[PDB]
Structure 1
Protein backbone atom coordinates (compact mmCIF):
# COMPACT_ATOMS: atom_id res chain seq x y z
CA UNK A 1 0.00 0.00 0.00
CA UNK A 2 1.53 3.19 -1.21
CA UNK A 3 0.86 6.15 1.03
CA UNK A 4 0.96 8.73 -1.72
CA UNK A 5 1.96 12.12 -0.23
CA UNK A 6 -1.37 13.70 -0.98
CA UNK A 7 -2.86 16.58 0.80
CA UNK A 8 -0.48 16.68 3.76
CA UNK A 9 2.21 18.94 2.44
CA UNK A 10 0.06 21.49 0.64
CA UNK A 11 -2.06 21.77 3.76
CA UNK A 12 0.97 22.03 6.04
CA UNK A 13 2.61 24.72 3.90
CA UNK A 14 -0.68 26.56 3.81
CA UNK A 15 -0.85 26.97 7.59
CA UNK A 16 2.44 28.82 7.40
CA UNK A 17 1.54 31.22 4.61
CA UNK A 18 -1.32 32.01 6.97
CA UNK A 19 1.07 32.99 9.70
CA UNK A 20 3.13 34.92 7.23
CA UNK A 21 0.40 37.22 5.97
CA UNK A 22 1.54 40.80 5.91
CA UNK A 23 5.13 39.97 5.06
CA UNK A 24 7.12 41.79 2.39
CA UNK A 25 7.58 40.20 -0.99
CA UNK A 26 8.37 36.52 -1.17
CA UNK A 27 8.35 36.32 2.61
CA UNK A 28 4.53 36.24 2.27
CA UNK A 29 4.28 34.09 -0.86
CA UNK A 30 7.11 31.49 -0.60
CA UNK A 31 6.85 28.69 1.97
CA UNK A 32 10.58 28.48 2.23
CA UNK A 33 10.57 32.19 3.01
CA UNK A 34 7.87 32.29 5.56
CA UNK A 35 9.54 29.52 7.55
CA UNK A 36 12.69 31.55 7.54
CA UNK A 37 10.90 34.79 8.37
CA UNK A 38 8.67 33.13 10.85
CA UNK A 39 11.55 31.48 12.64
CA UNK A 40 12.78 35.00 13.32
CA UNK A 41 9.50 36.38 14.53
CA UNK A 42 9.10 33.51 16.97
CA UNK A 43 12.39 34.38 18.59
CA UNK A 44 11.98 38.14 18.22
CA UNK A 45 8.68 38.09 20.13
CA UNK A 46 9.81 35.86 23.01
CA UNK A 47 12.81 38.10 23.26
CA UNK A 48 10.59 41.19 23.32
CA UNK A 49 7.89 39.74 25.58
CA UNK A 50 10.72 39.28 28.03
CA UNK A 51 12.03 42.75 27.16
CA UNK A 52 8.76 44.74 26.98
CA UNK A 53 8.73 44.44 30.74
CA UNK A 54 11.88 46.52 31.30
CA UNK A 55 10.74 48.93 28.62
CA UNK A 56 7.90 50.52 30.54
CA UNK A 57 10.03 50.24 33.65
CA UNK A 58 12.24 52.86 32.04
CA UNK A 59 9.36 54.88 30.58
CA UNK A 60 7.91 55.11 34.04
CA UNK A 61 11.20 56.07 35.68
CA UNK A 62 11.64 58.89 33.19
CA UNK A 63 8.12 60.18 33.93
CA UNK A 64 8.97 59.96 37.63
CA UNK A 65 12.36 61.65 37.63
CA UNK A 66 10.68 64.32 35.52
CA UNK A 67 8.35 64.93 38.46
CA UNK A 68 10.77 65.02 41.37
CA UNK A 69 12.83 67.42 39.34
CA UNK A 70 9.73 69.60 39.72
CA UNK A 71 9.76 69.27 43.49
CA UNK A 72 13.51 69.96 43.63
CA UNK A 73 14.77 66.43 44.34
CA UNK A 74 15.85 63.51 42.10
CA UNK A 75 14.62 59.97 41.45
CA UNK A 76 17.53 58.18 43.08
CA UNK A 77 16.81 59.84 46.41
CA UNK A 78 13.02 59.94 45.92
CA UNK A 79 12.95 56.18 46.00
CA UNK A 80 15.23 55.71 49.00
CA UNK A 81 12.73 57.89 50.83
CA UNK A 82 9.95 55.54 49.78
CA UNK A 83 12.08 52.51 50.71
CA UNK A 84 12.80 53.98 54.12
CA UNK A 85 9.25 55.29 54.66
CA UNK A 86 7.98 51.75 54.06
CA UNK A 87 5.82 52.73 51.09
CA UNK A 88 5.53 50.09 48.38
CA UNK A 89 3.63 51.67 45.52
CA UNK A 90 5.08 50.37 42.25
CA UNK A 91 6.82 52.56 39.67
CA UNK A 92 3.91 51.87 37.38
CA UNK A 93 1.40 53.51 39.67
CA UNK A 94 3.98 56.04 40.69
CA UNK A 95 4.12 57.60 37.23
CA UNK A 96 0.41 57.00 37.11
CA UNK A 97 -0.19 59.52 39.86
CA UNK A 98 2.52 61.71 38.43
CA UNK A 99 0.36 62.76 35.47
CA UNK A 100 -3.15 62.09 36.76
CA UNK A 101 -2.79 63.21 40.41
CA UNK A 102 -0.04 65.83 40.86
CA UNK A 103 -1.03 66.80 44.39
CA UNK A 104 -1.03 63.15 45.48
CA UNK A 105 2.43 62.72 44.03
CA UNK A 106 3.58 65.87 45.74
CA UNK A 107 2.37 64.37 49.07
CA UNK A 108 4.35 61.26 48.36
CA UNK A 109 7.41 63.45 47.70
CA UNK A 110 7.05 64.82 51.22
CA UNK A 111 6.90 61.53 53.20
CA UNK A 112 9.99 60.29 51.39
CA UNK A 113 11.59 63.72 51.76
CA UNK A 114 11.03 63.50 55.49
CA UNK A 115 11.77 59.77 55.75
CA UNK A 116 15.30 60.16 54.30
CA UNK A 117 16.48 61.92 57.44
Structure 2
Protein backbone atom coordinates (compact mmCIF):
# COMPACT_ATOMS: atom_id res chain seq x y z
CA UNK A 1 0.00 0.00 0.00
CA UNK A 2 0.99 3.60 -0.56
CA UNK A 3 1.09 6.10 2.27
CA UNK A 4 1.33 9.60 0.82
CA UNK A 5 1.93 12.56 3.11
CA UNK A 6 -1.75 13.42 3.08
CA UNK A 7 -2.67 15.30 6.21
CA UNK A 8 0.35 14.98 8.43
CA UNK A 9 2.75 17.75 7.34
CA UNK A 10 0.10 20.49 7.19
CA UNK A 11 -0.91 19.62 10.73
CA UNK A 12 2.67 19.73 11.99
CA UNK A 13 3.28 23.08 10.31
CA UNK A 14 0.14 24.46 11.85
CA UNK A 15 1.28 23.53 15.40
CA UNK A 16 4.47 25.49 14.85
CA UNK A 17 2.80 28.53 13.29
CA UNK A 18 0.26 28.71 16.09
CA UNK A 19 3.14 28.88 18.62
CA UNK A 20 4.72 31.63 16.51
CA UNK A 21 1.71 33.96 16.57
CA UNK A 22 2.80 37.48 17.40
CA UNK A 23 6.22 37.17 15.71
CA UNK A 24 7.36 39.75 13.13
CA UNK A 25 6.81 39.32 9.40
CA UNK A 26 7.67 35.88 8.09
CA UNK A 27 8.58 34.69 11.60
CA UNK A 28 4.81 34.17 12.15
CA UNK A 29 3.79 33.40 8.55
CA UNK A 30 6.48 31.07 7.20
CA UNK A 31 6.86 27.64 8.82
CA UNK A 32 10.61 27.73 8.36
CA UNK A 33 11.21 31.12 9.95
CA UNK A 34 8.69 30.35 12.67
CA UNK A 35 10.53 27.15 13.55
CA UNK A 36 13.88 29.01 13.73
CA UNK A 37 12.37 31.73 15.84
CA UNK A 38 10.94 29.17 18.23
CA UNK A 39 14.27 27.36 18.69
CA UNK A 40 15.73 30.54 19.99
CA UNK A 41 12.57 31.39 21.94
CA UNK A 42 12.67 28.15 23.91
CA UNK A 43 16.36 28.55 24.79
CA UNK A 44 15.75 32.08 25.99
CA UNK A 45 12.77 31.03 28.09
CA UNK A 46 14.88 28.34 29.75
CA UNK A 47 17.81 30.74 30.29
CA UNK A 48 15.56 33.49 31.54
CA UNK A 49 13.65 31.33 34.00
CA UNK A 50 17.06 30.82 35.58
CA UNK A 51 17.96 34.45 35.16
CA UNK A 52 14.64 35.64 36.62
CA UNK A 53 15.74 34.33 40.02
CA UNK A 54 18.92 36.42 39.91
CA UNK A 55 17.08 39.44 38.55
CA UNK A 56 14.74 39.58 41.51
CA UNK A 57 17.40 38.94 44.17
CA UNK A 58 19.36 41.87 42.82
CA UNK A 59 16.28 44.04 43.02
CA UNK A 60 15.53 43.08 46.62
CA UNK A 61 19.15 43.64 47.59
CA UNK A 62 19.12 47.14 46.07
CA UNK A 63 15.94 48.07 47.92
CA UNK A 64 17.30 46.56 51.13
CA UNK A 65 20.45 48.55 50.72
CA UNK A 66 18.47 51.81 50.39
CA UNK A 67 16.35 51.03 53.44
CA UNK A 68 19.47 50.22 55.49
CA UNK A 69 21.30 53.41 54.57
CA UNK A 70 18.35 55.35 55.94
CA UNK A 71 19.31 53.89 59.34
CA UNK A 72 23.04 54.45 59.02
CA UNK A 73 24.37 51.15 57.75
CA UNK A 74 25.02 49.49 54.41
CA UNK A 75 23.56 46.24 53.13
CA UNK A 76 26.63 44.10 53.72
CA UNK A 77 26.75 45.08 57.39
CA UNK A 78 23.01 44.50 57.75
CA UNK A 79 23.27 41.00 56.36
CA UNK A 80 26.16 40.16 58.65
CA UNK A 81 24.18 41.35 61.65
CA UNK A 82 21.14 39.32 60.66
CA UNK A 83 23.39 36.26 60.43
CA UNK A 84 24.85 36.84 63.88
CA UNK A 85 21.37 37.44 65.27
CA UNK A 86 20.14 34.21 63.68
CA UNK A 87 17.36 35.97 61.77
CA UNK A 88 16.56 34.04 58.57
CA UNK A 89 13.94 36.25 56.83
CA UNK A 90 14.85 36.13 53.15
CA UNK A 91 15.69 39.02 50.85
CA UNK A 92 12.29 38.87 49.16
CA UNK A 93 10.55 39.52 52.47
CA UNK A 94 13.20 41.94 53.75
CA UNK A 95 12.56 44.08 50.68
CA UNK A 96 8.80 43.86 51.21
CA UNK A 97 9.16 44.87 54.88
CA UNK A 98 11.45 47.72 53.87
CA UNK A 99 8.63 49.22 51.80
CA UNK A 100 5.40 48.03 53.44
CA UNK A 101 6.44 47.88 57.12
CA UNK A 102 9.15 50.44 57.88
CA UNK A 103 8.77 49.99 61.71
CA UNK A 104 9.44 46.27 61.49
CA UNK A 105 12.41 46.76 59.16
CA UNK A 106 13.82 49.37 61.53
CA UNK A 107 13.40 46.82 64.30
CA UNK A 108 15.33 44.28 62.21
CA UNK A 109 18.05 46.85 61.69
CA UNK A 110 18.39 47.32 65.46
CA UNK A 111 18.78 43.62 66.08
CA UNK A 112 21.40 43.50 63.34
CA UNK A 113 23.42 46.36 64.82
CA UNK A 114 23.13 44.81 68.30
CA UNK A 115 24.10 41.33 67.13
CA UNK A 116 27.49 42.52 65.87
Q: State the TM-score, normalizing by the size of structure 2.
A: 0.99
Q: 1: distance between equivalents of 2:74 and 2:4?
A: 72
Aligned residues: CA RMSD: 0.3
Q: Which runs of 5+ in 2 are unaligned?
A: none
Q: How much has 1:7 moved relative to structure 2? A: 0.3
Question: How many residues are aligned here?
Answer: 116
SS of equivalent residue, structure 2 residue 103? helix
Map 1:1-117 onto structure 2 (within 5 A): 1-116=1-116
Q: 2: distance between equivalents of 1:6 and 1:83?
A: 67
Q: State the TM-score, normalizing by the size of structure 1.
A: 0.98
Q: 1: distance between equivalents of 2:79 and 2:50?
A: 25
Q: Which runs of 5+ in 1 are unaligned?
A: none
Q: How much has 1:92 moved relative to structure 2? A: 0.3
Deviations 1:61-115 (A, max 9, x none): 0000000110010000000000000000000000010000001000000000000
Q: How much has 1:50 moved relative to structure 2? A: 0.7
Which runs of at least 4 in structure 1 moved beyond 3 Å after TM superposition?
none
